[PDB]
Every structure is written in structure tokens, then in C-alpha cells.
Amino acid sequence: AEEFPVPNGFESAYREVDGVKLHYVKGGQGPLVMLVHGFGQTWYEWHQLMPELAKRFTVIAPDLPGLGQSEPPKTGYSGEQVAVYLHKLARQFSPDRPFDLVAHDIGIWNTYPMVVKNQADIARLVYMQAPIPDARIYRFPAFTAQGESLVWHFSFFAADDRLAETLIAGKERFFLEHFIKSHASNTEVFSERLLDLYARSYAKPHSLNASFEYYRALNESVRQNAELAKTRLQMPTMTLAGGGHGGMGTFQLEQMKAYAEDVEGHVLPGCGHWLPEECAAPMNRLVIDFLSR
Amino acid sequence: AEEFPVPNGFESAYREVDGVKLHYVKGGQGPLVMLVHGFGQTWYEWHQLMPELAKRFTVIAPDLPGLGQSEPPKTGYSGEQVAVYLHKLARQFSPDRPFDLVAHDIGIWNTYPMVVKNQADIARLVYMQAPIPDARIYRFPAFTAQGESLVWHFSFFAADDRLAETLIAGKERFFLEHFIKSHASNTEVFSERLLDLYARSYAKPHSLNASFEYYRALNESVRQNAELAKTRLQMPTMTLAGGGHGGMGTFQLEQMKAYAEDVEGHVLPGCGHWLPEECAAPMNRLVIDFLSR
């Protein structure tokens, strides 16, 4: 019944949060670290980091609402709405201590509002490989002198008429493999077995739709964040980005400098978008050291 | 067999040009005007303008290579390669006199090189609703505060692994309706009957692939034009652009001023991309008046 194999010593479980049944994988002991995945993926993208982190922390990795084995949200897909589910989930497990947060891709979109509104609950923050929704996203190019651009998919996924679901249905494995590899530097880490697992998961009709609903809410999140951003983040923050094909480069740290007072950043040469898989060992090391300081 | 109904008094015919059988519709008497369609359509987009122009001109409307009933090109799909076919076709019917040219969308891409290389063969020029391929196209955004951007489809159509044909095959009628209407202001001119006609034509497998090969050659066309643009156009030119949803707005004229010495531009309010259909009366009047000087 599990969509992905659970690491030894971890449990797959469910918690109801505001009427929404969320799936997560949990292990370890100590202060809580929540890990939040992004588009095309599930909790499983963290499966190499989780056992190392569980040596020193309690580690929880949820499926975003509607993705993996988590139920769709009953409110909506904008960042402020989804962030409520994730914040209350973390609070069920760390009610008496601030917790750490690591997020990738749209996991950023779905956590930033709860970080900025509940700063006393967040001990340390790691964000990798996606902009915080704001006006800067309107500057990315539609097309480049080398071919397809990094984020033309924002428009593809946000289009109405269920454009993305209709074109991708029946071709979910084909599309996801193209999407992953077109934003990767290191494609060999994506075995046919691994692509099969991710494709089977997001091909569930409610999960295919949920994937794109995050993008259909992106302009709403941008508008939400315009007000939230008047309060800068005060906790220690680290950004990570790939320096290779598919990576955000220096954008990640430069944007975060406008949001956070105490921020450090690293660009990983030879790595693209999918840092936990393409560049697991150095990504894991940087996260662990930053969180363990 | 005709994919579209020929206007009364016109003939549907073919002509072999450098080994490629081009389809065209021809009527009228007098000096030659060639009308060149763009993406998603065929010669038929001109069918309301042709009877009017034919009162004063010989009018020819070819199908672009690979599209409508024309064979794919044997050289390639870059602007400079395709323009050879169109120039030679026009000169078969106007061997000793300059002709007029009207082009829409990627018809611009496929005619600009033969215009700049054979300026004495072009009496007057009308371009509407697309950039000439140059470095400006790398500045359009992937995503806008309103949502879908104008030209995110550049990356989609240019993507490798035949991404666009693989996703759109079997769904051509769905996709073309969405593409056309999302770039329109006056959407109700696109009846189901008309969409059926256009979709059946570009769903031919070689036409679906040809459609996207034009975008796969776009960066080559940009590199070609960087050299060709060192000479400005000297003949009278007019640009038209829609001012409504889907329209190029002031960009059309502002770019043309870098390419032409003698240019007047119009922005048609309440009109999007598909000027001949969305705004037939004002567009036809503008074109007929400009060519009748």
C-alpha cells in the first residue's frame, strides 16, 4: 500500500489536520526537523537524508496535500492556506520547542507564510531550489538562446481548461522523466525504478490535479506574500542551490537576503534542481552541519 | 481534396518549388500580393480578406511548408531556409515586377529574410502579431501577474524529445482551441465549426511536427537575422497588433522601427492575436487602404 519504501527505523503514519488526512514518515529522537518536498516528488526525496538526520533529531517528512498519500486541502492551494496544515502538523509533534524546517521547490511556497507568521516556532530554516513567490518570478524569461527556459512550466501548469492534466494524462511517466531530466545536471541518479515510483504517485488523478493547483494559486501566493514580507525573518537561515543546468545559481541567496537578517548560502557546482538526489552527499552534509550547530 | 472552402472565383493549386510541393489559393487580377499565415492556421485565415483584395490585385495565399496541404521543406525550418521557397513561389507569378507581402505570426519569421535579401522584389509590406526573431524574444517573461504569458509556448514547442508532439498527439482539437482562445480577445468568432476545420489540418502527423519544427529552428533564425538586420528595410511597411488579450500591443511597431526606415503602426483595441478573424472589418480596411496607395 506504501507508494515508496520506508527506511529502517521509520514509521509511515497519518494525522488529521483541520479535516485533512495527511501522510508522513517519521523517525528519530530529539528536536523536530520537518522536511517538505516539492513538485513531481513526495516525502521519498528525503529518504537518504532522513536516516543521517535521525541520529540527532526527530525527523518528519509529510506529503504535501493532494500529493503522495496526503488528502487534498479542503481550503485551497495558496501558500497561506497550505502552510496552516503543515504548521499544525509540526505542532502536534513539537508543541513545547521550536522546530527546524527544510524545504525544496514548492515546499518553500507552502511553508514561508507559516514561518513568517510564527517565527518563535521556527528554530532554523533551510530553503533550496525555488523562489519565494514574489514579483521576482515575473522576470524569468520565457525562452533562452539555448532552448527551453527554467520556469516556462509555471505558465503551463497555471493554465486553465485543465490544460496540463489533459495533455499529460496517459503520458505521466514520459512527461515526468522529461521534466526531471530537463532540470537536472546529473541524470544517471534517476533509475527507471525511481522514475516509475514517482510517476505512479503523481499519476493518481487527484494528485495530477493537485500538482498543478499549486501553480494555479501562485499569483495568489505572490499577493499574499507581498503583505507577509513586511516582517523580515529573524531565525538562522541557509539557502542551497545548484550551480549546474537546472539550478537557481546565485538567485536563491540573493532573494533570501531580502527576506532574512541572518542568512548563509551555498551554490553546488555540478548540481541541478534535484539536490537531494543529484547531490545527496554534499547537500546532506551542509544541512546536517547547519542544523547541528 | 480541400481542407478549407475556396472563395468563389479562386483556385486551389500546387506548385513544385525546389523539390517541395506547395499548396496555394489564387485569385484576382493585377499586381501580386502574397499573404502568409502563421501557427495553428493555414491560408484560410485570409479567406475574408482575399475577395476584397482580389478586386485590385492578384492574390496568392500559400500554406507554409509542412502545414495545410504543403509538403515539408527539404532544407530546413529556419527563417532563411523557408523564405527561399516563398520568394521563389512569388516570383513564379511576378517574375518582372515587385509584389506586396502580408504576413501574420510565424509568417513573419519565414518571410523577413527574403524581404531583406531581395528588397527590390517587395513593393509594400504588412506584418502583424509576432516579433521578428532577434534577441528581444529572450526578454519576454515566462509568467505574468495576470497568469499565462504570451510566449511561454516558445519553450514548450522548442523542447527536445518531441515533448510537444508527444503530449498533443490525439488531443489536437483540445489543444488548438485552448491555444487560440487563450490568445484572443474576441473569442466568440472561434466557433466549434471553425476550430474543427483548423484542428483537422494541423492534426496530420507531419503537420503537427512541422508546426513545432519552426520553433525548434527559432534560435537559428535569430542568429541568421543578427547578420541580415545590418541592412534596414527601405520599402513602405505597416505593422498591426492587437491591443486586447493576446495582442502584442506597442511592441510590434517599436521593434519594426529598428528594422524599417518607413513604417506606420496600428494597435487595434479589443483584438488579440488573431486579427483577421477577431477584427476582420478594421484589419481588412487597414490592409486594403495601405496596399492601395
Tell me the three cell numbers of residue A249.
545559481
Residues A143, B158: C-beta atoms closer than 8 Å:
yes
Instruction: Using an 8 Å CB-CB cutoff, list chain B residues near A182.
Output: 159-160
Sign of the alpha-carbon torsion through A52, A53, A55, A60: negative
- Identify which of A64, A195, A149 has the alpha carbon closest to the alpha carbon of residue B157: A149
Interface of B with A in 113-152 (CB under 8 A): 135, 137-152
H or E segment to which residue A278 belongs:
helix A275-278
Tell me how far apart the alpha carbons of residues B261 and B276 are, in angstroms, rounded to a whole number: 26
- CA distances for B146 relative to A76, A222, A223, angstroms: 19, 11, 11
The helix-helix angle for A205-216 and A192-203 (nearest 10°) equals 80
CA distance B39 to chain A (A): 17
Task: Measure A140 CA to nearest chain B CA, in Å.
Answer: 6
- Hey, of B106, B136, B137, B152, which one would you mutate to test binding to chain A, going by the most A CBs within 10 A of its CB? B152
B171 contact A CB<8A: yes
- The CA-CA-CA angle for residues B7, B27, B90, to 5°, reads 125
CB neighbourhood size of A92 (10 A):
12
SS3 B160: coil
Sequence-distant (6+) residues with CB within 8 A of B189 are B274, B277, B278
Task: Report DSSP letters for B104-127, one per residue.
Answer: ETHHHHTTHHHHHH-GGGEEEEEE
- Which of A106, A109, A151, A155 should one mutate to test binding to chain B, selecting the residue with the greatest count of B CBs within 10 A? A155
Cell numbers placing A192:
527507471
Indicate yes or no: CB of B145 within 8 angstroms of CB of A222: yes
Cell of A119: 517565527
Any residues with CB less than 8 A from the CB of A145 and at least 6 apart, and which?
A: B135, B138, B219, B222
Residues in chain A: 293
Nearest to B138 by CA among A113, A145, A196, A25: A145
B38/B67 Cα distance (integer angstroms):
9
A173/A204 Cα distance (integer angstroms): 12
Could you give the CA distance from residue B33 to residue B90 in angstroms, rounded to a whole number? 9
Closest Cβ opposite residue B140 in set A141, A154, A159:
A141
Tell me whether residue B191 is exposed, middle or buried, using C-beta atoms within 10 angstroms of its C-beta: 0 to 12, 13 to 18, 19 or more.
exposed
Instruction: Report which residue type is found at A139.
Output: R
Give me A124's grid cell: 532554523
Neighbouring C-beta atoms of residue B148, cutoff 10 Å: 19
Contacts of A171 in chain B (CB under 8 A): 166-167
Read off the C-alpha cell for A256.
533570501
**Is B137 close to A158, i.e. CB distance below 8 A?**
no
Distance CA B104, CA B43 (A): 11
Non-local (6+) Cβ contacts of B33 within 8 A are B53, B57, B58, B59, B60, B99, B100, B101, B102, B291
Closest CA to B43 of B3, B93, B73: B3
Place of cell 468563389: B8
Nearest to B178 among A161, A174, A182 (CB): A161
- 3-state SS class at A106: helix
Interface of B with A in 33-92 (CB under 8 A): none
What residues in A contact B135, CB-CB < 8 Å? 145
Closest residue in chain B to residue A161, using alpha carbons only: B178
**Residue whose C-alpha is closest to residue B160's, from A64, A174, A131, A233:** A174
Please name the amino acid found at residue B121: D
User: Would you give the distance in Å from CA A177 to the centre of its chain?
Assistant: 18
A182/B159 CB distance under 8 A: yes
Chain B residue whose CA is closest to A219: B145
Residues A273, A105: Cα–Cα separation, whole Å? 8
Do B90 and B32 contact (CB within 8 A), yes or no?
yes
What domains does chain A contain, in order, with CATH numbers?
A: 9-292 (3.40.50.1820)
**How would DSSP label each residue in A54-98?**
TTTSEEEEEPPTTSTTPPPPSS-SSHHHHHHHHHHHHHHH-SSS-
Q: What is the DSSP-derived secondary structure letter of residue B68? A: T
| DSSP helix/strand/coil, A238 | strand
When scoring A167, A178, A218, A225 by the number of chain B Cβ atoms within 10 A, the one with the most, hence best to mutate, is: A167
Kindly determine whether residue B149 and residue A140, on different chains, have CB atoms separated by under 8 Å.
no
Phi and psi at residue A42, to the nearest 5°: -145, -170
Q: What is the CA radius of gyration of chain A?
A: 17
CA dist A279 and A101 (Å) reads 19
Contacts of A121 (CB under 8 A, 6+ apart): A87, A90, A91, A94, A98, A99
Q: Is the dihedral of CA B85, B123, B222, A183 positive or negative?
A: negative
Question: What's the CA gap between B256 and A184, in Å, rounded?
Answer: 38
DSSP letter for B141, please.
B
What is the nearest CA distance from B253 to chain A, expressed in angstroms?
21
Q: What's the DSSP call for residue B260?
A: B
Residue B129: half-sphere exposure toward Cβ, Cα within 13 Å: 29
Q: Classify the C-alpha dihedral B110-B113-B118-B120 as positive or negative.
A: positive
* A window 189-218, beta carbon within 8 A of B: 218
Residues of chain B by 3-state class (helix, strand, coil), percent to 5: 40, 20, 40
Instruction: Give the Cα separation of A134 and A153 in Å (integer).
Output: 17
Q: Hey, what's the cell of A261?
A: 537578517
Experimental structure resolution, Å: 1.9
Going by C-alpha positions, the residue among A70, A40, A74, A68 that lies closest to residue A168 is A40
Which residues are bridge partners to B239 per DSSP? B127, B265
